[PDB]
């Protein structure tokens, strides 16, 4: 399925994902696309920080859901 | 992250927010906590009125930053 | 909001301020505009000397209110 990832500068990218994908996997895909190390990535959905070991399904992240990406050092 | 919101009577409250949160969202949270309609809320930071559609990141509002809340009719 | 500041020679200037601004901040703005050190500035409103640590709201100083500026050595 597709999900949207929106940055703090208002740019949205799309990712092909499955509900069984972990947040770790998602950050890995974002690295594949944008070259950002997963350690610098923060993903938030419905005001929550998303934990690396949990899946998208765990957070009820569905088709065409929007995650917010916040970079941190 | 946490931000402080200081009122005209010298009371400070705290809000859990993310850089991707809009000013609208922040006023919504203040309504959640205090029952003030967002339309009666004014938020200022560094002498600027904050616009509802912009985000905290847009205004460089970071961790433990202090917003000033001014109520208006 | 805007406030007026009237001098002893009958000159009025305008300042962009917020109710949460302290008298200290106001004197700082007057320094920004006119080069007068805050220590040489006295602000009065409704016959009262205004204290540096208090805010405009504390003194019920509102939109288009007029403060009187008295310089002292």
Whether A45 and A73 have beta carbons less than 8 Å apart is answered as no
Cα–Cα nearest to B36, from B56, B60, B18, B11: B11
Distance CA(B46)–CA(C25), nearest Å, equals: 11
- Closest Cα in chain A to B22: A8
Give the list of residues 6+ apart from residue A16 with CB closer than 8 angstroms, or none: A1, A2, A29
Distance CA(C3)–CA(C66), nearest Å, equals: 6
Nearest CA of chain C to the CA of B51: how many Å?
Answer: 15
Integer CA distances (angstroms), B54 to A39, A44, B3, in order? 27, 18, 16
Distance CA(A13)–CA(C62), nearest Å, equals: 47
Interface residues of A toward B, Cβ cutoff 8 Å, are: 6, 8, 44, 47, 68, 70
Phi, then psi, of C13 in degrees rounded to 5: -115, 165
In DSSP terms, A49 is beta-bridged to A44
Cα–Cα nearest to B51, from B60, B42, B62, B64: B42
Distance CA(C20)–CA(A29), nearest Å, equals: 46
Is the CB of B70 less than 8 angstroms away from the CB of C16?
Answer: no
Cα–Cα nearest to C55, from C47, C64, C45: C45
A-chain CB neighbours of B33 within 8 Å are: none
Write out chain B in H/E/C secondary structure. Answer: CEEEEECCCCCEEEEECCCCCEHHHHHHHHHHHHCCCHHHEEEEECCEECCCCCECCCCCCCCCCEEEEEECC
Q: CA geometry: angle at C18 spanning C40 and B27, to 5°?
A: 150
Is the CB of A44 less than 8 angstroms away from the CB of B16?
Answer: no
Q: Which residue has the tokens 């994908």?
A: A21
Q: How many CB atoms lie within 10 A of CB B5?
A: 22
C24 sits in which H/E element: helix C23-34
Neighbours of chain B (3+ CB pairs under 8 A): A, C
Distance CA(A61)–CA(B56), nearest Å, equals: 24
Whether C50 and C60 have beta carbons less than 8 Å apart is answered as no
Structure tokens at A17: 């994902």
**Nearest-CB residue to A44 (from B20, B55, B57):** B20
- Closest Cα in chain B to C15: B47
Q: Which residue has the tokens 């106001």?
A: C26
Distance CA(A32)–CA(A35), nearest Å, equals: 6
Resolution expressed in Å: 1.8
């Amino acid at each position: 399925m597709q999900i949207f990832v929106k940055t703090l500068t208002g740019k949205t990218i799309t990712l092909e994902v499955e509900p069984s994908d972990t947040i770790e996997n998602v950050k890995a895909k974002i690295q594949d696309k944008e070259g950002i190390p997963p350690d610098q990535q923060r993903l938030i959905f419905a005001g929550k920080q998303l934990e690396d070991g949990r899946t998208l399904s765990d957070y009820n992240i569905q088709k065409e859901s929007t995650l917010h990406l916040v970079l941190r050092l």
